[PDB]
Symmetry: C3
Subunit: 457 residues, 3 copies
Amino acid sequence: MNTPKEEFQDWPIVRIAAHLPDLIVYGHFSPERPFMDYFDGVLMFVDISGFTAMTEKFSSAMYMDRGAEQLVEILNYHISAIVEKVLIFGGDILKFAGDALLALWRVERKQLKNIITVVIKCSLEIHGLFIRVKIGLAAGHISMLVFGDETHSHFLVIGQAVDDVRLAQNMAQMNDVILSPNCWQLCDRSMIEIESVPDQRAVKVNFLKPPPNFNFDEFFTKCTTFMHYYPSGEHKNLLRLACTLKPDPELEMSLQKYVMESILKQIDNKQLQGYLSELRPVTIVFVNLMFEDQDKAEEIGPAIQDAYMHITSVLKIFQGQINKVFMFDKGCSFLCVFGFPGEKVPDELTHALECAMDIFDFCSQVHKIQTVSIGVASGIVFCGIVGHTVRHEYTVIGQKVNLAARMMMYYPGIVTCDSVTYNGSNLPAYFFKELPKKVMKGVADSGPLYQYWGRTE
Amino acid sequence: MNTPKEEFQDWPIVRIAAHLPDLIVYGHFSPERPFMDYFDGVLMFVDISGFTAMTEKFSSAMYMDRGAEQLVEILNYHISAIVEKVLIFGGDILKFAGDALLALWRVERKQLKNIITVVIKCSLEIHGLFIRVKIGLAAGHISMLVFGDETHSHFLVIGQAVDDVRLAQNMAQMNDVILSPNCWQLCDRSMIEIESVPDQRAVKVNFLKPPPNFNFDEFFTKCTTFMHYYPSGEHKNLLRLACTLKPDPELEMSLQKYVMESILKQIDNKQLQGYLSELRPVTIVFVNLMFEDQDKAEEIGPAIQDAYMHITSVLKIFQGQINKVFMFDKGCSFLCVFGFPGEKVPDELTHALECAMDIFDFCSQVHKIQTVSIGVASGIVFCGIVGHTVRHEYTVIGQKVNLAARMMMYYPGIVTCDSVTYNGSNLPAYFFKELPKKVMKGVADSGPLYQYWGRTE
Amino acid sequence: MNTPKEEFQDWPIVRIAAHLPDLIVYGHFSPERPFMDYFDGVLMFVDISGFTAMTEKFSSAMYMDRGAEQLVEILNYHISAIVEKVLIFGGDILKFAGDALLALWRVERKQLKNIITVVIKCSLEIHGLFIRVKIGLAAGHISMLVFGDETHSHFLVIGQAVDDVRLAQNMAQMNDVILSPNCWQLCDRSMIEIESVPDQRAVKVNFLKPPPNFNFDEFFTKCTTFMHYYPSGEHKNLLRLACTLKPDPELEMSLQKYVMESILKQIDNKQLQGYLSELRPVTIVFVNLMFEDQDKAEEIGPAIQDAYMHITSVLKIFQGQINKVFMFDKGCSFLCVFGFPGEKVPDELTHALECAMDIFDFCSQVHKIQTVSIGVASGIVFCGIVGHTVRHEYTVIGQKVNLAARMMMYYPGIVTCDSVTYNGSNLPAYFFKELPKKVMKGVADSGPLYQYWGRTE
Ligand SMILES: [Cl-]
Ligand SMILES: [Cl-]
Ligand SMILES: [Cl-]
Ligand SMILES: [Cl-]
Ligand SMILES: [Cl-]
Ligand SMILES: [Cl-]
Ligand SMILES: [Mg+2]
Ligand SMILES: [Mg+2]
Ligand SMILES: [Mg+2]
């Protein structure tokens, strides 16, 4: 009796799970919204610098109209290698945002110290492989928030360790690995050799200096005891346990809610893969919500849900999409896009502005939202699936993405727009106000910037 | 000198052969029609109960418009496992019909007794893996009929063993394996422990009770001597020898005639795979032809060919397709569909009715057809490729499929239709007659049913 | 710590490289045009006879509109096997043209004699596998020319060895391997048993007669010292080193210039694979340029570039494409096609004729072009990707392709067209002249042939 080869089955549930972390795939939590949970872990925020520039260059004539295809190929080639290292070292990639990603090693409190050594080692091997890579690490208490409606779900992580990992990463120079103060306080200092950072309590890693008799492969093995989904045994040749997920319509119904419809179309083999890699003109609407205490999920969770319910209803009407949500700019940011594959309306600019205004007015009166700020910017952006075959997400990359984010941060409390949006919109000039030009971290020169003052006053 | 890896080649001929049994793939018989052949074997009819209900549920809002994709995934996950067991145990899957399949172990007469033990073991391992599975087994003489025209071919098996396997399967309770009386008469009774079945000569299998020294792997090995296409040697890692078929335009011309054009389009990479999995509104026209003696291929073969020639010409004109033909309802049944992927006409209902009438009038005068009965039912049905990668077929599943079949059986000798068809058709009310409602095995409640009386009388 | 399987990555650069030889993939030469380089090697020209006939047969009704799919399948099945043998024996496939291919073993001069024995052995194993295969071999000095503009590149090989391999191949009878005189002069005659060929200095191979103690596997191993890209070590399971190419946007920009846009669309997963295999009506415009000395790249290179610049600009305007360029008919031939996938214009015939005339007038005054001849023929031709997964190219095959080539050769110095083109064009009868019918090698019977005299005279 034969025992024939069983070919890998790439069921749709498995394809869906590539778009999500283990935190969601294996989370099985309640469908109530908001839902919050609490745990401890180590975070790694990894940023490839330079892709934002490459993006502008990939529009030039030398790319012969295959800029999008060439960009995504060279991006994924690099990001794939970073993803593999993260996964092999036992991390869970939570989210990709542009040319950056955030990874989590969730463990019990007693295990943080040892897992920090694992993540440092991982970081040093990533910084090794290689555009510059910058890595921020943090460790401690972490909250998760899941919010949404009956057809869409989103998650975010929240708390001091989350704020820290982003602060740590911004201090990083080309190729630095930076530890948050708490991470440094919790790590095995007898092994980790650091320099201090000026006017900063975070530290920089110089190297690992293991003691005699220390064997990293053995230490790692001990650490895998604490890793719930590390591939092992018959599945030790796989990068993710999620590669083994079997059809389950209840689970798939729950997981699909996190993935955009156009991605589900590709997964379902109802649209060519090539279709979603593009360099296309879009409008970015970047919404920031600030709270009195951005580390307190039980306060901010309801407010985020409330804002989300309104945001999604106005985006439906003005035809936009939420690409990504994350904690950023001392608050919760929604990266919204008008003109994704299949949503290209005319009057996109006008609508992006009226939508931004509606969101601004409504969110300003949600309880516990202290300040709303929205940046609107338009131009050619890269849209596509970024990452590894086994772990990847749809994202946007471009100078207008960064501009919209910087606008919302440097012009808090108002709706701002760039010149392309201003000039191209339908709206009368006196609905706007020309603003003082600010020097903005990561921005060569915006043309003129404007406040969208709106119809009255 | 290198000896590089030879990658599997998925030539179009190999893709075509997934849609057919070995009985056809390796049959090399005459292209004359009808063609009949005669042999002996064991039949296994396997039915997954419950998918017909799942189908209705997969239309609900909770599936978020991915019902078809979710249905086919969970269906194939289960059916795939059953297919693998059948193939590993040396069976040839002849046909899929909805959530059921029919498999054949063709052998010489002297080998039936031993092969029955093999098939029982297979059945018990299938009933093991697991919606309820019901299995009917029969053994004996089998006739094959191939009918068609110069561009299309169809086959069917015929005879007492075929009638038996279907009778045996209908008696099965959830998870029973039932043997036909002849199978029980031919099997190795010293090994097989049964209970009797009330007012029935068929029996139920309780278990295999092998004698001392009996080793199933050795016994199976002996039995493979009689299996012409069991994968072996260098190909013992394959589920089917047909996976090794090499391009041959004469063979491919002959095999393609059994596969619908829209499936050939997908095989040819001229249409996305996703395209053919759908939950779509269709009209089922289920035609039953009864003969004086439904076990006698030399009598019924010509008549079936004759009916087929007419059926296919009227379906071409009213725009329908033959999905499947099989012996059923004490006769030969054609499962015909109006509105498959690419054939969606307006006035589909009217046309389905006029086509049904034309087929009824013509077939009623074909010599040797005793009674024609046709059931017409309309609604949302699942259409898609069901089975394993290496062995799968396009099929339809749904409550309106079952209704059309039950109508043709419980209202013999006339053309009947459901309420959706009646109400939606173009035709005047007096072309119909409202019928007495019958209690119908496998039907909760049809709305009102009608006879299509037609234009005169 | 796991060491998971790394799946093959089929990056777009790797897909592009399937369409090119190692001579270009690993060439890294200047982007200036023309560019010429010089080396030595052995050439193998392999021709499958009979596919041109098969092509006409695959249009008949018996193929049920899947002629194109069936033709390409049976063609690639055979050509694939020849490609594998060439690659395993260390050859570089330079180009496919219809059902023929040209392969190169580039080496230093001292190594020609040994490499000739390798290529003879290869040839004998190819002639073995098997429509008739005919093989011509030549050896000596070879020039390469790369020509083009800022978005398109083409290469060609030139010189006496190139003329020889084509002459040798035309003398071959069914299943002969023929050596050019120089190849025979350079080979290891103590091992190679030949017959002479009448009124010919080329010879035919009867067999390899190795001496005692000669071991082909050891000899081959020694010879691989001289083969720069022979897959070895960790990559010895691959048919081509190019299968390992990694993303590199500079390299990909340079390589894509050789591949047509519609092929890049498929590579980019923006078009279904099936789309480019077709039997479609096209117009072939076959341009031949003769020079005083067709073996002298430094003279003819500039002229070819000059002609190319004009040809490509008129083809853009009359909507045609260069399919292939190669030395042929004592000159440089451009195989141009009107009506490829996506370029089907109305008045295609008229335009093909006016384009042919423009090219004829311009090329006749390029310095160093002695004679221009152009054959125009229209009908159903096979268009598709021919070859092996790892090495394949888009090509055209058909009786009208061969007719256009024979016309340009047998009616030098003028533009000629077939009857389909004449009758179907828009143009007045007196723009043409009906020509004397010539007996043409490889042509059963053209209908009437015409000169396109043009508007004046
Ligand atoms: Cl997050
Ligand atoms: Cl998100
Ligand atoms: Cl059947
Ligand atoms: Cl059938
Ligand atoms: Cl060439
Ligand atoms: Cl070429
Ligand atoms: Mg970045
Ligand atoms: Mg059923
Ligand atoms: Mg040829």
